[PDB]
Amino acid sequence: ADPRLGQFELEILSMQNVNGELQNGNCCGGARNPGDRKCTGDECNTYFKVCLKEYQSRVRAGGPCSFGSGSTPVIGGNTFNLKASRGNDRNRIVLPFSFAWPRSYTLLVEAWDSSNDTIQPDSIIEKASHSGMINPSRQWQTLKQNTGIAHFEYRIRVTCDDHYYGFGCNKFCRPRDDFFGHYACDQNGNKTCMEGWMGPECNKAICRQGCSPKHGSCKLPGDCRCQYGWQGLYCDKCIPHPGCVHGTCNEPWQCLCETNWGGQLCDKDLNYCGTHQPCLNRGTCSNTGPDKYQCSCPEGYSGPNCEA
Amino acid sequence: ECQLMPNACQNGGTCHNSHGGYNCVCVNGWTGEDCSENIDDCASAACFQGATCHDRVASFYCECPHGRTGLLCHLNDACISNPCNEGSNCDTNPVNGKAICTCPSGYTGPACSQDVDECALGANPCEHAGKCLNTLGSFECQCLQGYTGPRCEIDVNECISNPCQNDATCLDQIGEFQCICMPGYEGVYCESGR
Numbered sequence: 001a002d003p004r005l006g007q008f009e010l011e012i013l014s015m016q017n018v019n020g021e022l023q024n025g026n027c028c029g030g031a032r033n034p035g036d037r038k039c040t041g042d043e044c045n046t047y048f049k050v051c052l053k054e055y056q057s058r059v060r061a062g063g064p065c066s067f068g069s070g071s072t073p074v075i076g077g078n079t080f081n082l083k084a085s086r087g088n089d090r091n092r093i094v095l096p097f098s099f100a101w102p103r104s105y106t107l108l109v110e111a112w113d114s115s116n117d118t119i120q121p122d123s124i125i126e127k128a129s130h131s132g133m134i135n136p137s138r139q140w141q142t143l144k145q146n147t148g149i150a151h152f153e154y155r156i157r158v159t160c161d162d163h164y165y166g167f168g169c170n171k172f173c174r175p176r177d178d179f180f181g182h183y184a185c186d187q188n189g190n191k192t193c194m195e196g197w198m199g200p201e202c203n204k205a206i207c208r209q210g211c212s213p214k215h216g217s218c219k220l221p222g223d224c225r226c227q228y229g230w231q232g233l234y235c236d237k238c239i240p241h242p243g244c245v246h247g248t249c250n251e252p253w254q255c256l257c258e259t260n261w262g263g264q265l266c267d268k269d270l271n272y273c274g275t276h277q278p279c280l281n282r283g284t285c286s287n288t289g290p291d292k293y294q295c296s297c298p299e300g301y302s303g304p305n306c307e308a
Numbered sequence: 309e310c311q312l313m314p315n316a317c318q319n320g321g322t323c324h325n326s327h328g329g330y331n332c333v334c335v336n337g338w339t340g341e342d343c344s345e346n347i348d349d350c351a352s353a354a355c356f357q358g359a360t361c362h363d364r365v366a367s368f369y370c371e372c373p374h375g376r377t378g379l380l381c382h383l384n385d386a387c388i389s390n391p392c393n394e395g396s397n398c399d400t401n402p403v404n405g406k407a408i409c410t411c412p413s414g415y416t417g418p419a420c421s422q423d424v425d426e427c428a429l430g431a432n433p434c435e436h437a438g439k440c441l442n443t444l445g446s447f448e449c450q451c452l453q454g455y456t457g458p459r460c461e462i463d464v465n466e467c468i469s470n471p472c473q474n475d476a477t478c479l480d481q482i483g484e485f486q487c488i489c490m491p492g493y494e495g496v497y498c499e500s501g502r
């Protein structure tokens with residue numbers, strides 16, 4: 001189990017209590033000075049309880065911590081500053097939530113003196129109540145309770161879990177690079193296509209530049225697959241009929257003969273005379289048939305090539 | 309010379325400047341003094357059975373009826389019988405006339421009449437543990453309760469129907485909601501007073 005969209009985070013920064021007295025006005029396990037009413041004795045054993053609940057216009061004295069609760073162990077005496085403590089999470093409380101963050105909340109922070117014996121309960125040092133609104137963000141908000149005699153300071157923020165975005169940690173975006181898509185997720189959970197892809201799902205390959213729109217397609221970026229009867233880098237060149245030797249095409253399977261070439265396959269020399277100079281002894285040639293010739297010989301010469 | 313006439317022996321014809329008169333030897337396929345008239349190769353062409361024949365230089369073009377193709381339109385094209393499915397372009401081989409099908413996305417096979425199992429490609433398109441469901445020429449996502457959209461990427465906002473009552477705060481959760489009652493109210497929907 002344990003699903004979660006995010007967590008409310010609170011850390012106790014500092015606590016100040018020169019006197020060392022409960023909110024009763026009595027000393028934390030100490031006796032009163034006869035003069036100047038000073039507390040003499042051991043300091044408070046300060047720990048914190050936290051209660052996070054639905055935002056309420058009128059803060060209630062009762063009711064459950066609907067968004068969760070937690071508490072620290074004893075983290076200091078009467079006065080201590082933890083703002084510079086790095087790597088210590090004892091002063092840290094994390095409340096995970098599996099609902100869309102409402103953004104309105106009511107929060108209760110309490111400092112308590114840890115009892116000195118088994119028989120006595122604890123007694124509260126100072127109690128704080130704060131209602132407000134907070135957006136998911138990695139930046140902290142510092143709050144200070146400084147109305148009473150003891151004062152403390154703490155910080156809060158709401159963090160979405162991975163693949164969650166928006167004010168409610170409710171918008172999803174999980175990057176992928178497979179058949180069904182090729183994208184990353186930006187800050188706002190919008191999809192940003194990987195290079196070479198396009199479309200809302202980033203699953204439509206961007207073909208080779210100049211690839212024929214009509215006769216070319218690509219299943220992979222930078223490629224150009226030609227429809228039947230087309231060829232070339234851009235798939236913009238027709239394929240002549242198979243067996244077409246000296247011909248070209250304007251549409252597939254055509255065979256349009258070059259100069260002085262004939263036959264459906266353009267494999268028949270129409271100028272065998274000019275091509276081979278077959279006649280001899282000044283005999284004059286005639287392209288009598290495709291791939292065929294006949295010589296007219298000068299007087300005294302006979303034969304197809306005019307040899308005496 | 310033959311230079312006085314800009315054009316004599318027009319088509320692959322070599323001028324002969326004999327004392328009696330100009331003479332032309334010509335490339336095969338042409339005939340006449342200047343060899344300006346195309347020999348009709350269609351009078352002896354192999355275009356047959358309804359082909360419209362067009363004369364070329366020592367060649368001919370067989371215009372084909374719809375149910376035939378080829379150099380001579382001597383064979384029938386299989387694309388006339390529609391072997392390929394809808395969405396598939398049917399092309400004809402020039403040599404044998406067999407139909408060549410180019411399948412649209414979602415279909416495969418020689419006739420392009422076979423669904424592609426997009427759920428059998430090694431990846432699940434459905435987020436949040438959705439079940440890929442195969443569709444004829446396509447696929448679908450069987451989403452879980454609380455998730456919708458084509459890929460189960462949208463969390464349903466079950467608080468859209470305002471199920472909580474008496475100004476209770478509704479919490480949008482996965483596949484259900486939660487009511488948080490005002491002071492003096494109780495119930496799953498905060499419907500009972502006091």
Ligand SMILES: *[C@@H]1O[C@H](CO)[C@@H](O)[C@H](O[C@H]2OC[C@@H](O)[C@H](O)[C@H]2O)[C@H]1O
Nearest residue numbers: 466467468469470471482483484485
């Ligand atoms: C819309 O309001 C109605 C009451 O008018 C609720 O019954 C609906 O909640 C129901 O569908 C969503 C599920 O997640 C809940 O379990 C179910 O009660 C609410 O969508």
Ligand SMILES: *[C@@H]1O[C@H](CO)[C@@H](O)[C@H](O)[C@H]1NC(C)=O
Nearest residue numbers: 166171186187188189190191
């Ligand atoms: C990015 O996401 C925001 C929501 O925060 C949305 O309003 C916006 O339309 C998205 N970007 C574009 C280009 O639409």
Ligand SMILES: *[C@@H]1O[C@H](CO)[C@@H](O)[C@H](O)[C@H]1NC(C)=O
Nearest residue numbers: 451454455456457458462464
């Ligand atoms: C999500 O699926 C439900 C089916 O229960 C449907 O009613 C709803 O319109 C779908 N939402 C979107 C955005 O497709």
Ligand SMILES: *[C@@H]1O[C@H](CO)[C@@H](O)[C@H](O)[C@H]1O
Nearest residue numbers: 385386387388389390391
């Ligand atoms: C026309 O289509 C049929 C199948 O419907 C195929 O068998 C033939 O070969 C084709 O010409």
Ligand SMILES: *[C@@H]1O[C@H](CO)[C@@H](O)[C@H](O)[C@H]1O
Nearest residue numbers: 413414443445446447448
């Ligand atoms: C079936 O799958 C295709 C993508 O292959 C999609 O475009 C359709 O919307 C779906 O029905």
Ligand SMILES: *[C@@H]1O[C@@H](C)[C@@H](O)[C@@H](O)[C@@H]1O
Nearest residue numbers: 271274320322333334335
């Ligand atoms: C003259 O004779 C004609 C038939 C062609 O062979 C030409 O190439 C040549 O110059």
Ligand SMILES: *[C@@H]1O[C@@H](C)[C@@H](O)[C@@H](O)[C@@H]1O
Nearest residue numbers: 282283284285296297298
């Ligand atoms: C062709 O006829 C032959 C007999 C010779 O007279 C050649 O010079 C002419 O080109």
Ligand SMILES: *[C@@H]1O[C@@H](C)[C@@H](O)[C@@H](O)[C@@H]1O
Nearest residue numbers: 054055056476477489490
């Ligand atoms: C949710 O809780 C309910 C009871 C009210 O206090 C609302 O204002 C709050 O958003």
Ligand SMILES: [Ca+2]
Nearest residue numbers: 347349364366
């Ligand atoms: Ca001709």
Ligand SMILES: [Ca+2]
Nearest residue numbers: 424443445446
């Ligand atoms: Ca399918």
Ligand SMILES: [Ca+2]
Nearest residue numbers: 464480481482
């Ligand atoms: Ca929900």
